[PDB]
Design an enzyme around this catalytic site. Structure first.
Site, PDB file in Angstrom:
ATOM      1  N   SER A  61       0.774  -1.247   0.000  1.00 48.69           N
ATOM      2  CA  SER A  61       0.000   0.000   0.000  1.00 48.69           C
ATOM      3  C   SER A  61       0.806   1.299   0.000  1.00 48.69           C
ATOM      4  O   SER A  61       0.252   2.354  -0.225  1.00 48.69           O
ATOM      5  CB  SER A  61      -1.015   0.027   1.156  1.00 48.69           C
ATOM      6  OG  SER A  61      -1.939  -1.047   1.011  1.00 48.69           O
ATOM      7  N   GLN A 117     -11.125  -4.783  -0.149  1.00 44.89           N
ATOM      8  CA  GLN A 117     -10.633  -5.635  -1.233  1.00 44.89           C
ATOM      9  C   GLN A 117     -11.590  -5.713  -2.413  1.00 44.89           C
ATOM     10  O   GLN A 117     -12.814  -5.825  -2.244  1.00 44.89           O
ATOM     11  CB  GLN A 117     -10.421  -7.068  -0.700  1.00 44.89           C
ATOM     12  CG  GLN A 117      -9.478  -7.176   0.494  1.00 44.89           C
ATOM     13  CD  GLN A 117     -10.006  -8.077   1.609  1.00 44.89           C
ATOM     14  OE1 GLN A 117     -11.121  -7.889   2.113  1.00 44.89           O
ATOM     15  NE2 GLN A 117      -9.194  -9.049   2.013  1.00 44.89           N
ATOM     16  N   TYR A 147     -10.841   2.835   4.657  1.00 47.98           N
ATOM     17  CA  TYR A 147      -9.677   2.575   3.821  1.00 47.98           C
ATOM     18  C   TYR A 147      -9.976   1.445   2.869  1.00 47.98           C
ATOM     19  O   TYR A 147     -10.489   0.404   3.273  1.00 47.98           O
ATOM     20  CB  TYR A 147      -8.521   2.227   4.746  1.00 47.98           C
ATOM     21  CG  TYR A 147      -7.196   1.976   4.055  1.00 47.98           C
ATOM     22  CD1 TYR A 147      -6.775   0.681   3.814  1.00 47.98           C
ATOM     23  CD2 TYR A 147      -6.356   3.038   3.678  1.00 47.98           C
ATOM     24  CE1 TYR A 147      -5.555   0.419   3.220  1.00 47.98           C
ATOM     25  CE2 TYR A 147      -5.094   2.760   3.063  1.00 47.98           C
ATOM     26  CZ  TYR A 147      -4.733   1.465   2.832  1.00 47.98           C
ATOM     27  OH  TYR A 147      -3.496   1.184   2.269  1.00 47.98           O
ATOM     28  N   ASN A 149      -8.881  -0.517  -1.102  1.00 50.49           N
ATOM     29  CA  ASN A 149      -8.231  -0.648  -2.400  1.00 50.49           C
ATOM     30  C   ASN A 149      -9.181  -0.386  -3.551  1.00 50.49           C
ATOM     31  O   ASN A 149      -8.773   0.140  -4.604  1.00 50.49           O
ATOM     32  CB  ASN A 149      -7.684  -2.071  -2.570  1.00 50.49           C
ATOM     33  CG  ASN A 149      -6.435  -2.322  -1.781  1.00 50.49           C
ATOM     34  OD1 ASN A 149      -5.812  -1.411  -1.247  1.00 50.49           O
ATOM     35  ND2 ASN A 149      -6.039  -3.583  -1.732  1.00 50.49           N
ATOM     36  N   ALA A 315       1.666  -3.157   3.034  1.00 50.91           N
ATOM     37  CA  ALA A 315       1.977  -4.574   3.193  1.00 50.91           C
ATOM     38  C   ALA A 315       1.420  -5.403   2.085  1.00 50.91           C
ATOM     39  O   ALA A 315       0.385  -5.104   1.535  1.00 50.91           O
ATOM     40  CB  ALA A 315       1.435  -5.104   4.544  1.00 50.91           C
TER      41      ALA A 315
HETATM   42  B1  LIG Z   1      -2.109  -1.767   2.372  1.00 46.84           B
HETATM   43  O1  LIG Z   1      -0.737  -2.349   2.652  1.00 46.84           O
HETATM   44  O2  LIG Z   1      -2.600  -0.747   3.379  1.00 46.84           O
HETATM   45  C1  LIG Z   1      -3.194  -2.835   1.931  1.00 46.84           C
HETATM   46  C2  LIG Z   1      -4.180  -3.377   2.988  1.00 46.84           C
HETATM   47  C3  LIG Z   1      -4.973  -4.570   2.537  1.00 46.84           C
HETATM   48  C4  LIG Z   1      -4.955  -5.813   3.191  1.00 46.84           C
HETATM   49  C5  LIG Z   1      -5.684  -6.899   2.688  1.00 46.84           C
HETATM   50  C6  LIG Z   1      -5.735  -8.271   3.347  1.00 46.84           C
HETATM   51  O3  LIG Z   1      -5.613  -8.333   4.611  1.00 46.84           O
HETATM   52  O4  LIG Z   1      -5.921  -9.267   2.605  1.00 46.84           O
HETATM   53  C7  LIG Z   1      -6.433  -6.755   1.521  1.00 46.84           C
HETATM   54  C8  LIG Z   1      -6.456  -5.538   0.850  1.00 46.84           C
HETATM   55  C9  LIG Z   1      -5.723  -4.461   1.368  1.00 46.84           C
HETATM   56  N1  LIG Z   1      -2.436  -3.904   1.318  1.00 46.84           N
HETATM   57  S1  LIG Z   1      -2.392  -4.251  -0.250  1.00 46.84           S
HETATM   58  O5  LIG Z   1      -3.016  -2.845  -1.014  1.00 46.84           O
HETATM   59  O6  LIG Z   1      -0.780  -4.149  -0.766  1.00 46.84           O
HETATM   60  C10 LIG Z   1      -3.207  -5.695  -1.009  1.00 46.84           C
HETATM   61  C11 LIG Z   1      -2.633  -7.029  -0.701  1.00 46.84           C
HETATM   62  C12 LIG Z   1      -2.694  -7.526   0.611  1.00 46.84           C
HETATM   63  C13 LIG Z   1      -2.169  -8.775   0.936  1.00 46.84           C
HETATM   64  C14 LIG Z   1      -1.558  -9.557  -0.041  1.00 46.84           C
HETATM   65  C15 LIG Z   1      -1.485  -9.063  -1.343  1.00 46.84           C
HETATM   66  C16 LIG Z   1      -2.024  -7.820  -1.669  1.00 46.84           C
END
Ligand SMILES: *[B]([O])([O])[C]([C]C1=[C]C(C([O])=O)=[C][C]=[C]1)[N]S(=O)(=O)[C]C1=[C][C]=[C][C]=[C]1
EC number: 3.5.2.6
Length: 358
Positions: A61, A117, A147, A149, A315
């Site tokens: 993120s 998500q 928050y 995506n 993350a």
């Molecule tokens: B970010 O790092 O704020 C974002 C948060 C997020 C977490 C999850 C989850 O817990 O599955 C899903 C969507 C968003 N992270 S991320 O935009 O880089 C998406 C992502 C999370 C986990 C694994 C791969 C991609």
């Protein structure tokens, strides 16, 4: 590095790595505008490849900061306005819940409860349209922050539509190339794979999977050198020669909404400096960072405040990243790790380092 930087960094990060069982880490401190680099451990445990200043890490993120700046640059170009309805750029979004949802709401997670998500089953341009058409807001636009995506990711896709460029090509030509981020990628080329760290989740080596709006919400992989250069650029946008980009950086650090002690920018989040560390440390915890919170509109938005703690956690399943900087002090830090470890540990470490140097 000056011994003071060496000492606070080593005394902070060594224990962090030990407590959190981080396989590999890179840190950059920017101090009076100069970068200092630190590396530990392994990019690839099985092949014994160390973390170097050239190792690529998934930013997760923290990618949203690049998206917010690219959006900023498109606004500065006069290609889009944050006041524009979402439907101006996606006329196929005819469902009535979209009336009144603007690019600003997408960019700042205030559209009314767009989900964290995008569902896995969504892939095609038609899958995505269906998803947004069917989505039912829990709240009116511009009333609560959640928050998401699916929110900022849509913003990024729509923001580049007038340019005619793919999101990736817009990012390369308008942000990466001008800032000399020559080892920053949305798609890691074969030539650079030797430098792509593995992430580690439950002891298993993992890389981020393809997903809808991945590029826009969490697409970026980068080195500690390039991320230090990203921090310098956001610390001093006026040094940037490309006019719309300098302006775009400034727009992404404007304060659009307030919840508690935090302000929402485009990608970036900001607090007044001096910050109460428990306010940012506890604040970084997903318990607060990911919650539904009412927002107060900042009408009109406050231009980038130099006395700010500006930051973003990020993350993926296998990586954990953090960036924070204080423009008024020409000070900042990047922490890239190949394990997703808790946010408050990241912020605590960063505060301990920057507080000591400030
Ligand atoms: B970010 O790092 O704020 C974002 C948060 C997020 C977490 C999850 C989850 O817990 O599955 C899903 C969507 C968003 N992270 S991320 O935009 O880089 C998406 C992502 C999370 C986990 C694994 C791969 C991609």
């Amino acid at each position: 590095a000056p011994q003071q930087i060496n000492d606070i960094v080593h005394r902070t990060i060594t224990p962090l790595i030990e407590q959190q069982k981080i396989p590999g880490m890179a840190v950059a401190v920017i101090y009076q505008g100069k970068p200092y680099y630190f590396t530990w451990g392994y990019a690839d445990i099985a092949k014994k490849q160390p973390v170097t200043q050239q190792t690529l890490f998934e930013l997760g993120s923290v990618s949203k900061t690049f998206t917010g700046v690219l959006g900023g640059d498109a606004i500065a170009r006069g290609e889009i306005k944050l006041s524009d309805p979402t439907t101006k750029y996606w006329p196929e979004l005819t469902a009535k819940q979209w009336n009144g949802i603007t690019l600003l709401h997408l960019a700042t997670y205030t559209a009314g409860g767009l989900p964290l998500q995008v569902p896995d089953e969504v892939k095609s341009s038609s899958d995505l349209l269906r998803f947004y058409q069917n989505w039912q807001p829990a709240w009116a636009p511009g009333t609560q922050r959640l928050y998401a995506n699916s929110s900022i990711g849509l913003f990024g896709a729509l923001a580049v539509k007038p340019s005619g460029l793919s999101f990736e090509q817009a990012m390369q030509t308008r942000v990466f190339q001008p800032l000399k981020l020559n080892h920053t990628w949305i798609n890691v080329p074969p030539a650079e794979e030797k430098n792509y760290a593995w992430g580690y989740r439950e002891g298993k080596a993992v890389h981020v999977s393809p997903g809808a709006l991945d590029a826009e919400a969490y697409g970026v992989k980068s080195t500690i050198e390039d991320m230090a250069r990203w921090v310098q650029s956001n610390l001093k946008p006026l040094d940037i020669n490309e006019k719309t980009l300098q302006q775009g950086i400034q727009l992404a650090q404007s304060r659009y909404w307030q919840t508690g002690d935090m302000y929402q920018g485009l990608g970036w989040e900001m607090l007044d400096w001096p910050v109460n560390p428990d306010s940012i440390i506890n604040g970084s915890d997903n318990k607060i960072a990911l919650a539904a919170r009412p927002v107060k509109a900042i009408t009109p938005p406050t231009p980038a405040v130099r006395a700010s703690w500006v930051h973003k956690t990020g993350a993926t399943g296998g990586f954990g990243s953090y960036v924070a900087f204080i423009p008024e002090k020409e000070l900042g830090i990047v922490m890239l790790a190949n394990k997703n470890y808790p946010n408050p540990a990241r912020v605590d470490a960063a505060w301990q380092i920057l507080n000591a140097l400030q």
